[PDB]
Paper text:
Multidrug resistance-associated protein 2 (MRP2) is an ATP-powered exporter important for maintaining liver homeostasis and a potential contributor to chemotherapeutic resistance. MRP2 is a single polypeptide comprising of an N-terminal transmembrane domain (TMD0) and the canonical transporter core of two transmembrane domains (TMD1 and TMD2) and two nucleotide-binding domains (NBD1 and NBD2). Using cryogenic electron microscopy (cryo-EM), we determine the structures of human MRP2 in three conformational states: an autoinhibited state, a substrate-bound pre-translocation state, and an ATP-bound post-translocation state.
Because the structure of the E1462Q variant reveals more complete density of the R domain, we will discuss the inward-facing conformation based on this structure. The N-proximal half of the R domain (residues 861–893) forms a long loop along the inner surface of NBD1, extending nearly 90 Å into the TM cavity. In addition, the C-proximal region of the R domain forms a composite ATP-binding site in conjunction with the Walker A/B motifs of NBD2. By sequestering the ATP-binding site in NBD2, the R domain of MRP2 competes directly with the signature sequence of NBD1, adding a new layer of control. At physiological ATP concentrations, ATP is likely bound at the interface of NBD2 and the R domain, further stabilizing the R domain in the auto-inhibitory position.
Residue numbers in the entry: 1 to 262, 305 to 935, 963 to 1538
Write the structure that this text describes.
Amino acid sequence: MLEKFCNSTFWNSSFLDSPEADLPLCFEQTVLVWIPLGYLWLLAPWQLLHVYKSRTKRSSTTKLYLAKQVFVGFLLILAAIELALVLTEDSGQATVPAVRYTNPSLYLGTWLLVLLIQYSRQWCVQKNSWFLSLFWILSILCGTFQFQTLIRTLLQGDNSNLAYSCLFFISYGFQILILIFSAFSENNESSNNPSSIASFLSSITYSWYDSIILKGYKRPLTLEDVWEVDEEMKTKTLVSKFETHMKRELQKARRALQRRQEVPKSWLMKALFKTFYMVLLKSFLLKLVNDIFTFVSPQLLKLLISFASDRDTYLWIGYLCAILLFTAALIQSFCLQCYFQLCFKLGVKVRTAIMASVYKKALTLSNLARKEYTVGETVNLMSVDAQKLMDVTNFMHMLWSSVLQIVLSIFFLWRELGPSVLAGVGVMVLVIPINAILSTKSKTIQVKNMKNKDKRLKIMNEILSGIKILKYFAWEPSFRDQVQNLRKKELKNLLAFSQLQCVVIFVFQLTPVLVSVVTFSVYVLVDSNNILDAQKAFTSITLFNILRFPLSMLPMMISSMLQASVSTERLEKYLGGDDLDTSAIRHDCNFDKAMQFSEASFTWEHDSEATVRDVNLDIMAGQLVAVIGPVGSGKSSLISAMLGEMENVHGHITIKGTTAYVPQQSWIQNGTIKDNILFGTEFNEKRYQQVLEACALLPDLEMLPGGDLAEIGEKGINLSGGQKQRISLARATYQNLDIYLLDDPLSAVDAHVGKHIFNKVLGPNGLLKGKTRLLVTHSMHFLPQVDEIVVLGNGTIVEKGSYSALLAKKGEFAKNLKTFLRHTGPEEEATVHDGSEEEDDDYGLISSVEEIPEDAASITMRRENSFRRTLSRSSRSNGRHLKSLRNSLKTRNKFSIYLEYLQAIGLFSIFFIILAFVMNSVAFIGSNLWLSAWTSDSKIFNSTDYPASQRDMRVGVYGALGLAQGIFVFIAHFWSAFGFVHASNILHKQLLNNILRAPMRFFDTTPTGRIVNRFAGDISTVDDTLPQSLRSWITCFLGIISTLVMICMATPVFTIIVIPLGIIYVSVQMFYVSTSRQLRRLDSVTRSPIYSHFSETVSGLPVIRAFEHQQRFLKHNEVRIDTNQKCVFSWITSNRWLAIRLELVGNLTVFFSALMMVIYRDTLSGDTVGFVLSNALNITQTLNWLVRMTSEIETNIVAVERITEYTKVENEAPWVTDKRPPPDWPSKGKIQFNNYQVRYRPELDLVLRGITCDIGSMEKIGVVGRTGAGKSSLTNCLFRILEAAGGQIIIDGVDIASIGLHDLREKLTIIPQDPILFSGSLRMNLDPFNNYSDEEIWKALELAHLKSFVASLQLGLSHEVTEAGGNLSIGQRQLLCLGRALLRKSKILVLDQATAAVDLETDNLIQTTIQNEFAHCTVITIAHRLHTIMDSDKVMVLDNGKIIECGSPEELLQIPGPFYFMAKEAGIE
Ligand SMILES: Nc1ncnc2c1ncn2[C@@H]1O[C@H](COP(=O)(O)OP(=O)(O)OP(=O)(O)O)[C@@H](O)[C@H]1O
Ligand SMILES: Nc1ncnc2c1ncn2[C@@H]1O[C@H](COP(=O)(O)OP(=O)(O)OP(=O)(O)O)[C@@H](O)[C@H]1O
Ligand SMILES: CC(C)CCC[C@@H](C)[C@H]1CC[C@H]2[C@@H]3CC=C4C[C@@H](O)CC[C@]4(C)[C@H]3CC[C@]12C
Ligand SMILES: CC(C)CCC[C@@H](C)[C@H]1CC[C@H]2[C@@H]3CC=C4C[C@@H](O)CC[C@]4(C)[C@H]3CC[C@]12C
Ligand SMILES: CC(C)CCC[C@@H](C)[C@H]1CC[C@H]2[C@@H]3CC=C4C[C@@H](O)CC[C@]4(C)[C@H]3CC[C@]12C
Ligand SMILES: CC(C)CCC[C@@H](C)[C@H]1CC[C@H]2[C@@H]3CC=C4C[C@@H](O)CC[C@]4(C)[C@H]3CC[C@]12C
Ligand SMILES: CC(C)CCC[C@@H](C)[C@H]1CC[C@H]2[C@@H]3CC=C4C[C@@H](O)CC[C@]4(C)[C@H]3CC[C@]12C
Ligand SMILES: [Mg+2]
């Protein structure tokens, strides 16, 4: 039928099959002008309906709109005038074919729809959609063909049709211009994000993120300038969506579980599929489309080889094939990037929807299930389980995209070689089994590695925190070896694990060559008729390279799904747990009473004995009643039942109004004191001040360093029981509720503060004089000022009555009211916390193992190592003692590192390793040239002319070259492993000796947290991931370099393209790293908050639920999640930006190569066009891998830099010098000071000045003074802890300066101010140096009155001790340090005021012991008990750093003076 419509033939061989070939103006003016129209017509109504339903306000008109409308109008008028001219040309006696009638009319019809659809878009967000943007591309691609034919026809010399050509040419141009104009964003400039408003091209090449790329390059970027996340992902939206389906599923699962077996089994997985099936479908379609291109390239490569093999062909074939290869690569990359983006976005959505839902359940779960779990366990649950589920949802489509890819690949190989292909596959299948046996061994080793690493850190924390005591007694040398033993014991396991990992990389590295040698040898040797040729060989190599990945990622995917199974099972127990029952507390306005108990009976457990039994009482409003009883009576249980935290058994409770809670164990949040007192309330001034003053929290607040705005909590000043109780009471009284349930709020405070609080806050005349008060107490001091008292016994009420009535009853109250009341004095003080902010990770900026397939082994290990390391830190309980707020306040008053690391490794081995890797690359190029020659050999011979000698020679050499390649790699890997284990040893050892020898200034300025982190995190980083990246980068670089030598060697001209693309590569490279690095940090800083908040709320749930303050905390958690969800996307998109740019560069560098071998084909063979393209086909992704891998080693080298800084910290005076003292130097206790002047730090002034005193032998001296007089400095001046800015100290005629450092301390003894006990055994604390024998030790405890405890202990001197002697009680901790100093029996003893916490009897013993034992010695004591200072031969007085009075105490008191005035103030005599 088409023959009469048109006039020419549709298709004839003569049209083609010629040097010059072209489709006729019949095929081009038919199907090529029907496809574009069909797309627009068929698909128009769907887009019209999609706009119709969602029509909103019109947007302001912009210049682009009018340009796009006027160009279409020009097209319309052009088509109209063409139709008019055609109709006017021939009317009479001219059967003009309808191709000149329909085609003109068709276009005129379409342009109208284009005008309409464009206007409709003006009413939507994205103006330039995908519909028109794809239509224009289709039209241009279809119309390019008419162009060539038309031009040629005219150029050839025919002038018959010139209007049509000119008309068509004008339209084709205007189409180009319209397509160009249809790419501009034309933004409304919405500050949220430009993702919603972006044309098709911008949203497909990611050329809208680049703004941030320009912003972060100039100046560092903060959280302000990162675009917000879209509404579809906001936490509030995701939760509701997931909650609907969760609620709908669980109930059905519960019903199914109840119907049978008469705890759900599988509901979470379904709830997720039913919620997010649509994204799954879209991603599946995109992955299916991409999977096709993976096998398209090899066919074009075979066509190129065939075309270049012969000579009598046409150029058009080669040019068309090159263009097709370019287009296929571009399309495949564009589809793959979009699929990656969709999948990763879905993963993030799932992770947020699980984390927020877990948080929301945590604060509504029953008490039984909550008490079953642990505080840290639930935090680890959210921090680990949710992350595991994110990974298994980032790489699930692989499962189906493998069993298909593999199958397809196998099919092709068979259609290319024959039954021989099976031989290669089998060798490529046997590898996986072997890989497993080695992974299990690696895990087995790593477990013990982790165990030994844990203990070392436990000794490190103690020594770093208590560095003062070590210096005083000179115990530094022992701990050196004590920790080096553990270091070596760990190093051997590290070396074993390292050499095992090398075997695995070797098998995954040589498998390509092995499969090639086996397949080719079997194919050529199995039958004499078989003859190799270039196309078959090179295509087989390409398909092997394609297939090598899935068979090596499928094992990993199966292992991951196995972990996600148990992770899912654990979460479903928590998210599916029961809820607490509330059908026992009736919140009605009884009014008649604010409380009523109708024979209630509640139990803590499910069905155990009732803790509270048969309770019935009622108290009117405005009544203060006190609940008293013995220990374990059940008061707090009664108040918890009032709150409703127990399970009802029998009865009901009526409550009118709100409630307030003051728990026995005070709970404090993180933040300022003002934030804690407010607890989410509008700030006032007439009530805030009243609350603070009434709770007597004013004097203390004045003494805090920051006043009211002082950070309190885990990461700040740790207050004592006395204060934390007053803060809790102040918060409760400021919130101003109706019913107050106080549980012992006056226990930690003393008598004065307690009386003041009772008379000013809660009592007959106080702040809460109208509200009802229920207080539980243990002291009978405030009983007469109450209204009604109740005595609880065995959980039930024994007697209820007024104070006078109970006293008149004459029974239990008489005995009860004796001296039960217990008073508490000031309790300890504050405790500052050393900053330990460390959260650097290893697995970052990497989302799946599909983006960087070459390095899947290392990526998997890093994830597992990070997950394992998370638990340890959570379950660690670091015990670095603590510091007193008082003492802390006084204290306040470039490529070179790469060279350093290489020098630590050893340049001698580095040279040989580089030589080995380079030699391997040469053997690679050599093998390819042997095959290229072997394949070339075929053309000379034929089927029945191949000799046997050639057949054997062409394969023996191939085998030899493969063997050489394998050997050189193995050697390179074998040495690399050792070259590192040595580095970790020298770096740590060198660092430890230097850091352990630093002066006190450095230890005082830098917080302990920073110093200990270097010994733990960095050492782990510099001995684990570092080597993997350092060994992968060189392999990638050498592969790229080898590929380029091959292409340039074949055709020299290519050298030109190398320079330009490099300038682009190194440019595109700096940009990415200059931004990604900053986003990596932001992510870590904005994560820890979330887990901190969850831990806080879980610990303080009853207080949260007593005040009815749950919505605020839910909102806080939602904001904290939306801050991190905004930052993750900002790097998930950046990685996709780089890919489109580098995959484009990599595809361009192969397109040119192909064309350069079609213009110079004359001097080229088929095989030479094989080794050049077969390799260059896999250079696109290798660039992306190199940039990503070089963006990780650059981020990881930061470890070595830190370690180096502390290895070069200033040191103090040498331990031992040549100047030795006379034997038994401290013969007599003769000390003298000559104008001794000193300063703590060079920037600080002299603290002690003009000191001139004399110390006699066998003399007892008492140093006493005022605050800030430098009393304690005197001691820290005799142990040469500081220097000597002025003057000197002479003992036994020998200046302390001349004598060596470790030569002086040994012969001096000092009792520590705060007795500290190290871990280990009792022998280690008493004598780490094992110099003494047990016999003389056994005498020491006899003198110390401690032999009774130690003899009857579990062991003798071998008994272990926990942290800071936690197993031992306080009484012996101070006592033991007395015995420690007793063993040394030195000559000069410097005592200090350290008997403050020693009990009277013990104190007395300590005091007399000093006198009985130390008699033939000199004793200098700095003390505050002026009374105790009475027997000193000479009393020295310091004012502000100057000696004042030096005389006997009797003389000092006989003659009035500053000492006598102090004694008069003290009143000792
Ligand atoms: N959280 C709990 N879980 C289980 N049983 C508990 C719990 N708290 C208390 N009990 C049980 O109830 C008994 C009474 O505890 P409760 O704290 O009510 O007594 P109390 O007299 O108020 O104590 P105290 O005088 O020390 O404040 C305990 O000895 C124990 O047997
Ligand atoms: N670590 C330090 N860093 C800086 N200056 C310090 C440090 N320790 C002490 N000082 C300075 O030295 C002064 C004297 O401190 P020292 O403890 O010797 O005085 P003191 O009169 O014995 O104290 P107290 O009355 O509390 O027993 C401090 O007030 C302070 O100015
Ligand atoms: C598949 C397309 C899109 C790209 C691949 C190149 C195409 C255009 C080339 C590759 C091989 C070519 C064929 C090779 C040999 C012959 C036999 C001849 O007597 C008629 C033409 C015909 C059948 C050619 C037609 C064009 C052809 C199919
Ligand atoms: C708009 C662009 C993408 C169209 C691409 C095809 C163009 C560039 C091609 C198609 C047909 C080609 C022409 C075909 C034949 C000849 C005759 C020859 O003796 C000189 C080159 C010349 C004149 C070619 C020039 C380039 C040409 C016009
Ligand atoms: C399909 C899209 C993407 C690109 C289309 C490119 C087409 C139009 C190009 C690519 C290679 C070109 C051919 C290359 C060489 C010659 C030989 C010359 O003596 C006549 C023109 C002729 C025969 C060209 C015709 C046009 C041609 C076939
Ligand atoms: C993007 C696509 C559509 C256009 C670019 C295709 C390029 C590679 C094509 C288009 C026109 C082609 C040229 C057209 C005409 C001739 C003359 C002929 O005697 C030798 C080949 C030569 C010199 C062609 C080489 C290849 C060529 C330059
Ligand atoms: C097996 C191992 C020990 C071989 C050692 C390879 C050495 C020579 C290689 C591996 C990693 C390389 C570094 C990788 C990254 C960069 C960042 C770039 O901006 C400058 C070069 C620099 C700094 C490289 C210098 C050379 C380097 C240190
Ligand atoms: Mg209690």
